[PDB]
Chain A
C-alpha cells in the first residue's frame, strides 16, 4: 500500500525473507545448542537458503 511498482513487491519480499532467515537459523541453533550439539552456522545457512 505504501510502495507500488516493484518496490512494493521487491522490498516486501526482501524484508520478509531477511527476517525469516534470521529467525529460522536462530530457532534451529537454539534447539541444537540446548542439547550441547555444536554445528557451524554455515551448514544451517546452506539449508535455510
Chain B
C-alpha cells in the first residue's frame, strides 16, 4: 500500500517500479434563515 504515501507529496513521476521506493526513501532528505427577525420569534414564542 506504499502508493498511499504519494498523497503526502506532489507525486513526481513515479508509477512503474522502484521509483516509488526511491522517492519514498529520498523524501526524508527535505525533512430560510430568520436571524434578527424579532416578529418571527415572537410568533413562535406563543
- B-contacting residues of A (Cβ < 8 Å)? 2-5, 7, 11
Contact = CB atoms under 8 A, between A and B. Distances in A.
Interface residues of B, number: 7
A7 B41 CA distance: 8
Contacts of B44: 2-3
A12 to B, nearest CB: 12
Interface of B: 34-36, 38, 41, 44-45
| Interface of B, helix, strand, loop or mixed by DSSP | helix
B35 A7 contact: no
Given A4-B34, A5-B41, 12 more contacts: A2-B44, A3-B41, A3-B44, A3-B45, A4-B35, A4-B41, A5-B35, A5-B36, A7-B38, A7-B41, A7-B45, A11-B45
